[PDB]
Amino acid sequence: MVDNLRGKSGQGYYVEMTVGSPPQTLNILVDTGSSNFAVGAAPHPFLHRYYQRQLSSTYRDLRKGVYVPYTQGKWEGELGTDLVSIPHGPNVTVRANIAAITESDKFFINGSNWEGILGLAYAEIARPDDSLEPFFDSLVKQTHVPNLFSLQLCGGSMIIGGIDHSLYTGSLWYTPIRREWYYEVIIVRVEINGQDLKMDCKEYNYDKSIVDSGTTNLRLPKKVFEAAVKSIKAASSTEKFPDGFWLGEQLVCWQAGTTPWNIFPVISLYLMGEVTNQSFRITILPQQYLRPVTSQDDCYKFAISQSSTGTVMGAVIMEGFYVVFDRARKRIGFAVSACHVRTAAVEGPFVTLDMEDCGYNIPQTDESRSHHHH
Numbered sequence: 001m002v003d004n005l006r007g008k009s010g011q012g013y014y015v016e017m018t019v020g021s022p023p024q025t026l027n028i029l030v031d032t033g034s035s036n037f038a039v040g041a042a043p044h045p046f047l048h049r050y051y052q053r054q055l056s057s058t059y060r061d062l063r064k065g066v067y068v069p070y071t072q073g074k075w076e077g078e079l080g081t082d083l084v085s086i087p088h089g090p091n092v093t094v095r096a097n098i099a100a101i102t103e104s105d106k107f108f109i110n111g112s113n114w115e116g117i118l119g120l121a122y123a124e125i126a127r128p129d130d131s132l133e134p135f136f137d138s139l140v141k142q143t144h145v146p147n148l149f150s151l152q153l154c155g156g157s158m159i160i161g162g163i164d165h166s167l168y169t170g171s172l173w174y175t176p177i178r179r180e181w182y183y184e185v186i187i188v189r190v191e192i193n194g195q196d197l198k199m200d201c202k203e204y205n206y207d208k209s210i211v212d213s214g215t216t217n218l219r220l221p222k223k224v225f226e227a228a229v230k231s232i233k234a235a236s237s238t239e240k241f242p243d244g245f246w247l248g249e250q251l252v253c254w255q256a257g258t259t260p261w262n263i264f265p266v267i268s269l270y271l272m273g274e275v276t277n278q279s280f281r282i283t284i285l286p287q288q289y290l291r292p293v294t295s296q297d298d299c300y301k302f303a304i305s306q307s308s309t310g311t312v313m314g315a316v317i318m319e320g321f322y323v324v325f326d327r328a329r330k331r332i333g334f335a336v337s338a339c340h341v342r343t344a345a346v347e348g349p350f351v352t353l354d355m356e357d358c359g360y361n362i363p364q365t366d367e368s369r370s371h372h373h374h
């Protein structure tokens with residue numbers, strides 16, 4: 001399973017999955033921020049291949065549609081089940097739910113080389129509801145595959161059912177999964193070049209913090225975004241950038257190989273430790289957040305953006321790390337990645353005697369209160 005992913009942060013990382021019999025092998029974007037297995041199932045300007053239900057003798061229609069809006073764009077399709085296997089994964093075959101995407105807007109991107117998404121988060125956020133069993137749950141229930149996977153994103157490995165120690169150096173540090181819906185976690189402190197942002201720590205997790213391989217950027221709640229930008233600007237104040245750059249709408253450039261990296265600070269996110277009163281920190285390099293895209297110059301985009309739905313630790317963040325989704329023990333581990341040429345660091349423990357609760361409790365809507373989970 002080592003080396004079983006390909007891709008980049010701008011357009012995502014995909015694993016090979018074989019669906020149906022006779023086998024159709026598809027390139028699937030790995031998405032820890034959703035819970036549907038969904039695959040393009042009809043021609044599209046941007047698809048190199050798609051799922052042909054009519055070629056699969058093992059496909060079964062569920063006779064139910066599903067409509068998945070996103071803030072900008074959407075997919076919809078028909079639910080069914082089919083046999084699924086992972087060529088560079090364990091030696092098993094499962095029957096899983098698959099949404100056959102028949103229409104979409106702004107979902108498939110020009111030249112991505114993936115045809116489908118593998119939603120690895122939990123059933124609570126599956127569409128249309130939590131009774132549509134996500135792929136990984138079907139995988140574990142059907143086989144004896146251990147209930148964990150890891151992502152090493154460089155190009156990359158998703159190891160299913162195991163930790164591979166050749167993919168990381170140093171210590172593996174675990175933070176609890178706060179609740180099993182998204183891969184929710186809790187941020188206890190943020191430093192930018194050594195300086196504490198000094199916000200009430202609930203602000204860092206307002207209204208949640210998650211780990212999301214389907215998101216490119218580090219995304220931060222409004223007040224936290226504003227504080228970080230103020231701090232990164234202060235550090236880089238010998239360069240005056242236009243506003244569009246800080247909005248992630250404009251490149252900024254230096255002559256080939258002369259970029260003043262030192263003017264850009266490191267960002268440390270302190271995650272809750274498994275032990276009470278402890279945390280550990282993941283330290284993010286400017287090379288993660290300031291990404292190359294005037295082809296005599298080196299030009300870059302700012303990959304930190306504002307959020308109204310919480311902190312999102314996206315691909316630009318996970319790229320520096322071996323990240324273990326240890327669902328069995330309800331925790332997420334981080335270690336420094338062994339793919340490379342300041343380093344992204346994973347460091348701890350940090351003890352706080354001050355034992356604060358930094359999680360935010362999302363106000364409970366009547367609709368949410370109404371639902372039974374039997």
Ligand SMILES: CCCc1scc(-c2cn[nH]c2)c1C[C@H](/N=C1\NC(C)(C)Cc2cc(Cl)ccc21)C1=NC(=O)CC=N1
Nearest residue numbers: 009011012070072073074106107109213214215216217315
């Ligand atoms: C690391 C992989 C990131 C990827 S792969 C393909 C795209 C994409 C962009 N537009 N259409 C597809 C992105 C950017 C990402 N947006 C998306 N991620 C996905 C998971 C595929 C779900 C989705 C549905 C729609 Cl309808 C539009 C965008 C996205 C995203 N990144 C951010 O930084 C902020 C918001 N969305």
Ligand code: NA
Nearest residue numbers: 081095096097
């Ligand atoms: Na099934």
Ligand code: NA
Nearest residue numbers: 044102103104
């Ligand atoms: Na389509």
Ligand SMILES: [Zn+2]
Nearest residue numbers: 046047048049
């Ligand atoms: Zn093609």
Ligand SMILES: [Zn+2]
Nearest residue numbers: 371372373374
């Ligand atoms: Zn009931």
Ligand SMILES: [Zn+2]
Nearest residue numbers: 130372373374
């Ligand atoms: Zn339920």
